[PDB]
Each structure stands twice: as structure tokens, then as C-alpha cells.
């Protein structure tokens, strides 16, 4: 399908690990609106101090979706993971077979386009 | 048993070259010198010790003894029918 012999090989690599690792994602709103996407979720940590002590500990969710089924996701759209909901902030460009989805939490902040 | 005796004796040896048949016998058994398939007959001269290289071999099968109890087993059945026919065994066989 593609003049690599490697990407098609690694295309098989991503689908199985996405099957073996992570859960499904129930996207809400956006042009995709109702759809279900498989991906691998993880939520590392991050603590900011701001002033003297203003520890605002939180997390930075990630999804690692396959780019074929998540085209034109845009940015403002949200997403429900299992019972909890997130909202996408950045969609990384594909590494060759898939990319990384950077998730916010709660409601997306405004639009402020104009 | 008679047919089995032929075939077991019918295949004297075998050759284990990875080349073609025609080259193999022309290098291991002889033959060739054709006039103008059925492979090629080999003249029965004498001696004819062949040169070899690795990966090839000439193995001649030992086959097996042709009367492994056959004749004695033959007598037993012959005795059996001989009694049945009412005639002496030595006369019948």
C-alpha cells in the first residue's frame, strides 16, 4: 500500500498494541460527534508552585490514537473516557502510523477565535 | 512374496547429487555417448570407481534376506493342507 515495507509492517504493530493496551474512547461533540475509538490512556503528573506555595497538582492525559480514524478532530471537541470526560487540546502529527492526543479535563475553555 | 523379492533386489543403489540427472550419471556412473526421456543406459564394464565432491553420495542398499522364515512357514501350511488332502506331505511338496 506504501513504498516502505516497514510502515505497513509497523502498521500491524500499532493495531495489536492498541488492542492489547488501553481502552476505547467515546468521543462526544465535534464533527465526528458520536464515535468510538480505541487507544492507550495514561495520566502522568505535574506540580506547579506559582507563588510561594501555590501547588496546583494535576495531570496531563494522553491517548495515542491512530490517525486514520481521528482525522479532522479539531480542538474544541470533548471526549468521554469510560465514565469520565475529557477535551482534546493538541493532536500531534502522525509518527508514521499513529499520533498522540493531548487531553484537557472538564469543559473546554471558551473559544476566543474572533 | 515373489514380487517383493524382485523389487527389494531391483533397486541396487542410489545417488545423492544435487545436479541434474544427466550430468550426475555422466560423472558418477558413465553412460552418455548417445546417438541423437528414458535417461541413459550404462555399459557394464569393470571397476568404475567414481570421483565425488561433498553433498553427493552413492549408497547401495543391502536390501534384506529373501527367505526370512518363508520356506519353513511354507512347509507348515503345506503340511496343513497335506493332512487335509489325505495324501502324504512329502509326496505333495
Amino acid at each position: 500500500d506504501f513504498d516502505n515495507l516497514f510502515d505497513a509492517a509497523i502498521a500491524r504493530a500499532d493495531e495489536t498494541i492498541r488492542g492489547y493496551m488501553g481502552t476505547s474512547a467515546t468521543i462526544t461533540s465535534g464533527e465526528q460527534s458520536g464515535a468510538v475509538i480505541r487507544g492507550v490512556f495514561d495520566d502522568p503528573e505535574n506540580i506547579s508552585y506559582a507563588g510561594q506555595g501555590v501547588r496546583v497538582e494535576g495531570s496531563s492525559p494522553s491517548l495515542f490514537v491512530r490517525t486514520d480514524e481521528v482525522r479532522q478532530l479539531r480542538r474544541g471537541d470533548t471526549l468521554t473516557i469510560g465514565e469520565e470526560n475529557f477535551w482534546v487540546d493538541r493532536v500531534s502529527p502522525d509518527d508514521g502510523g499513529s499520533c498522540h492526543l493531548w487531553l484537557g479535563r472538564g469543559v473546554p475553555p471558551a473559544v476566543n477565535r474572533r | 512374496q515373489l514380487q517383493s523379492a524382485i523389487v527389494k533386489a531391483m533397486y541396487a543403489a542410489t545417488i545423492e547429487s544435487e545436479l541434474d540427472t544427466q550430468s550426475a550419471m555422466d560423472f558418477i556412473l558413465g553412460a552418455n555417448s548417445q546417438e541423437q526421456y528414458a535417461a541413459a543406459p550404462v555399459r557394464l564394464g569393470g571397476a568404475k570407481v567414481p570421483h565425488l565432491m561433498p553433498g553427493d553420495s552413492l549408497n547401495l542398499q543391502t536390501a534384506q534376506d529373501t527367505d526370512n522364515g518363508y520356506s519353513v512357514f511354507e512347509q507348515s501350511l503345506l503340511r496343513y493342507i497335506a493332512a487335509g488332502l489325505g495324501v502324504s506331505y512329502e509326496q505333495l511338496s
Partner: protein, 67 residues
């Protein structure tokens, strides 16, 4: 569905035979390695399902001698 996977198995043999049986593949922190079989086991394996399916003959009833 025997026949199509039979061809796929035959293809996989050809891929494995020359250079194409991918054992492992590595990306930045993403690797997977598949279990590797022999060649003879596959050869008898593919032989197993070609006879069971409806393709042409490959086996004959021994052989007799006449004179």
C-alpha cells in the same frame, strides 16, 4: 474460508522463505516481536489444509508393478 487463508499461508511461506518474515519491529519506545516458527512445520502445515480442501490431486494410491 479455508481457501483464502490457505493462499495467505502460502504467501506467508514465500514471505518467510526469502526475506519478509518480520520477527520484530521497533519504534520510539514501541516494539513488538512475533513468535517465529520453523520452515518444515509450515510446509507440512500448508500441506495439511491443501489436501483437506477441494483443490486438485497431489497424492496417488501407492504404485503397483507389472510385467
Amino acid at each position: 474460508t479455508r481457501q483464502e487463508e490457505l493462499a495467505a499461508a502460502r504467501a506467508a511461506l514465500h514471505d518467510l522463505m526469502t526475506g519478509k518474515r518480520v520477527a520484530t519491529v521497533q519504534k520510539d519506545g514501541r516494539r513488538v516481536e512475533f513468535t517465529a516458527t520453523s520452515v518444515s512445520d509450515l510446509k507440512k502445515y500448508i500441506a495439511e489444509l491443501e489436501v483437506q480442501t477441494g483443490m486438485t490431486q497431489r497424492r496417488r494410491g501407492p504404485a503397483g508393478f507389472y510385467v
